[PDB]
Structure 1
Amino acid sequence: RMMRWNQERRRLLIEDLEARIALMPLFQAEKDRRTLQILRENLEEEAIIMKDVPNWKVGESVFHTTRWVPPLIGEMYGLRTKEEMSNANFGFTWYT
């Protein structure tokens, strides 16, 4: 019975992993879209505060490579809502 039950369960495990497999492309488009927005939004504020800064371009990759680089969760929310930051850092661990 255990052999048959887990085989049934494994098939189910396959049926829902593929369900996200299908849903992922949408999430990828969404995540990126939103991610960039956070970076850019931070750019606006960045310029607003870095303009007065003496000879300090608003933003520059600490890394000279021009490859696209994912931002650290810290970069995305560090200057955003602290609560937002916290949620990203320890939100899942505390779950819900």
Structure 2
Amino acid sequence: LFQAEKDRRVLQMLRENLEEEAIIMKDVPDWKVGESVFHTTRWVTPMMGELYGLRTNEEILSATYGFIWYT
């Protein structure tokens, strides 16, 4: 169950980032929206700078150092 909901959460964050970047990056001339950086077409795990790249620094801090700093 945790695996299923983690998959849904990751996909939702990726879709939100995709839509907001499509809104933002229509101004520049030669930017394919949603373009990959890998030649392969298989699934790649997100880098966590791609899931939390457009969010507030509190969420970023909790996602990066939340477990390390919990004592």
Q: Give CA-to-partner distance per residue, 1:35-71, whole Å, 9 cap, x none.
A: 0100000011110111112120112110010110110
- Count the aligned residue pairs: 71
| Unaligned stretches of 5+ residues in structure 1 | 1-25
- Please say which structure displays the higher CA radius of gyration: 1
TM-score, with structure 2 as normaliser = 0.91
Higher RCO, Cα 8 Å, sep 6+ = 2
**Cα root mean square deviation, aligned:** 1.1
| Unaligned stretches of 5+ residues in structure 2 | none
Residues 19-38 of structure 1 mapped to structure 2, 5 A cutoff: 26-38=1-13
Q: In the aligned structure 1, how far is the partner of 2:41 from the partner of 2:13? A: 19
The sequence identity of aligned pairs, in percent, is: 80
Structure 1 runs of 4+ with >6 Å offset: none
Residue equivalent to 2:28: 53
Task: Report which of the two has the higher share of helix.
Answer: 1
TM-score, with structure 1 as normaliser = 0.69
